[PDB]
Amino acid sequence: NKANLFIISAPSGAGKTSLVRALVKALAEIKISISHTTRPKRPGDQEGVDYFFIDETRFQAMVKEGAFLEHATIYERHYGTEKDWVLRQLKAGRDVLLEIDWQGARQIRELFPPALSIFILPPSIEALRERLIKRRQDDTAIIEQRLALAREEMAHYKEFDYLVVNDNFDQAVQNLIHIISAERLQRDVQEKKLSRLLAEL
Amino acid sequence: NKANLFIISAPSGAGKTSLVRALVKALAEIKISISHTTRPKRPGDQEGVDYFFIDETRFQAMVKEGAFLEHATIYERHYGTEKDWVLRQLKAGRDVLLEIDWQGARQIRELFPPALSIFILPPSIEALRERLIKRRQDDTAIIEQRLALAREEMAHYKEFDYLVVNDNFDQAVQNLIHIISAERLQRDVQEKKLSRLLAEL
Ligand SMILES: Nc1nc2c(ncn2[C@@H]2O[C@H](COP(=O)(O)O)[C@@H](O)[C@H]2O)c(=O)[nH]1
Ligand SMILES: Nc1nc2c(ncn2[C@@H]2O[C@H](COP(=O)(O)O)[C@@H](O)[C@H]2O)c(=O)[nH]1
Numbered sequence: 001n002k003a004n005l006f007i008i009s010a011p012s013g014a015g016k017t018s019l020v021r022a023l024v025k026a027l028a029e030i031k032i033s034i035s036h037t038t039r040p041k042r043p044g045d046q047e048g049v050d051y052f053f054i055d056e057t058r059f060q061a062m063v064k065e066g067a068f069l070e071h072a073t074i075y076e077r078h079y080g081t082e083k084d085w086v087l088r089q090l091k092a093g094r095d096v097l098l099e100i101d102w103q104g105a106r107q108i109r110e111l112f113p114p115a116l117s118i119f120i121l122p123p124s125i126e127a128l129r130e131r132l133i134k135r136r137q138d139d140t141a142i143i144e145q146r147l148a149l150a151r152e153e154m155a156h157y158k159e160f161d162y163l164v165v166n167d168n169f170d171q172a173v174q175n176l177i178h179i180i181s182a183e184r185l186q187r188d189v190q191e192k193k194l195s196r197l198l199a200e201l
Numbered sequence: 202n203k204a205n206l207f208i209i210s211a212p213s214g215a216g217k218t219s220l221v222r223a224l225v226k227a228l229a230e231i232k233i234s235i236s237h238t239t240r241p242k243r244p245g246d247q248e249g250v251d252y253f254f255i256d257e258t259r260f261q262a263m264v265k266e267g268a269f270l271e272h273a274t275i276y277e278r279h280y281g282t283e284k285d286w287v288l289r290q291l292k293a294g295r296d297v298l299l300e301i302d303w304q305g306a307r308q309i310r311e312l313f314p315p316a317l318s319i320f321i322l323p324p325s326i327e328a329l330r331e332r333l334i335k336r337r338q339d340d341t342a343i344i345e346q347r348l349a350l351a352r353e354e355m356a357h358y359k360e361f362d363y364l365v366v367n368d369n370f371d372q373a374v375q376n377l378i379h380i381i382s383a384e385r386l387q388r389d390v391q392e393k394k395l396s397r398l399l400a401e402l
Contacts, residue, residue: 001247010210052311073237097359099250106287119388120283121395121399122209123398123402124398124401124402125402151402154402157388157399158361158388160388161387161388162383162387162388162391163386163387163388163392165385165398175382175386177380178379178382178383178386179276179386181376181383181384182363182380182382183332183383184384185360185363185364185365185376185379185380186363186364187320187358187359187361187364190363190364191364193365194322194364196323197322197324197366198322198358200325200326201325201352201355
């Protein structure tokens with residue numbers, strides 16, 4: 001009952017989306033924020049599952065309205081975290097996972113100090129290229145551009161609280177579980193959850 | 202290869218010693234500091250296993266010599282953490298567990314800032330009395346005195362980073378594992394352990 005935000009960032013092709021989806025299956029009382037994006041809906045994508053897919057007009061509206069807790073521009077497209085959904089989850093006592101880039105992370109850290117951030121590292125640059133190329137949904141020409149953006153994303157790893165290497169899926173998931181589980185044992189969180197016990201003693 | 206100190210504190214009778222012993226069996230690269238004490242050696246106690254049992258003359262000597270990283274007086278007896286052994290472990294890249302009281306914790310926090318501290322709570326005051334009474338090695342008259350010292354120890358829980366309830370042994374051990382495991386995934390620790398990978402990228 002002292003819910004927190006858990007920021008997860010990684011270069012494209014690091015396997016972050018899959019890790020986060022397994023994480024929420026393994027843990028209770030934690031949900032993934034579904035972002036809004038102007039990035040074109042790809043074959044395979046599902047509205048309300050991968051993203052809320054909208055156009056620039058809609059997204060710009062939300063920005064001016066202040067509907068986003070956080071928003072950024074990435075590869076000439078827009079992504080943002082709808083503010084109200086997140087706050088409803090926190091109110092309900094559920095932790096929230098934010099799969100956002102380094103720019104969004106900076107915003108969240110300012111706005112919600114207790115937030116913890118985790119950076120997912122690939123075991124090699126070649127691992128990124130491999131995973132990205134195998135996504136037939138993606139253009140195989142923007143690769144050299146996406147990999148360039150990946151190295152720049154990774155240069156920001158120093159801004160994060162934890163680093164986790166995705167070299168073995170199960171182990172990486174287990175490490176994410178350690179990090180969230182430990183947060184939930186912090187004195188600040190426990191003062192609330194153990195209110196009755198601490199009262200007795 | 203960025204080893205840390207993990208302080209474990211709890212009122213007498215909370216089952217801390219047993220938890221810590223199971224913890225070191227479950228994790229690698231972590232060792233328990235064996236303290237020096239003037240507290241009389243009890244039936245069942247083993248030299249170099251439970252404590253290094255010495256007399257006041259020896260202990261006072263160590264204090265004046267500065268042989269202790271940390272030392273305190275508890276129930277009119279002396280306990281301390283020999284400094285050199287701990288530093289050797291850290292140098293070797295091994296984390297160190299310190300089973301010390303709240304006074305010792307304050308000293309360690311000053312002396313070694315990265316240190317994390319965990320307070321073990323009993324599920325009830327009656328749990329302490331039960332566990333203590335069942336220790337036939339202990340005098341059953343000092344109980345009301347030890348329980349008084351337990352409530353005063355527990356009032357210091359606010360000085361600790363994490364709170365863990367020992368209501369189920371396996372679960373409490375698993376929570377200790379989360380806490381140490383998460384520390385080892387911190388960016389500061391990972392900058393060292395992942396030096397080669399970060400170099401490649
Ligand atoms: N700041 C921010 N970044 C996001 C958000 N959603 C996705 N991203 C970032 O945008 C990148 C592009 O994701 P993609 O277009 O590959 O699905 C992600 O890897 C992530 O770093 C968001 O809501 N806010
Ligand atoms: N400060 C400090 N406290 C210790 C040390 N060793 C044991 N203690 C504290 O002294 C208490 C008494 O332990 P006992 O006499 O029951 O074995 C422990 O519960 C612990 O809080 C030590 O090396 N330093």
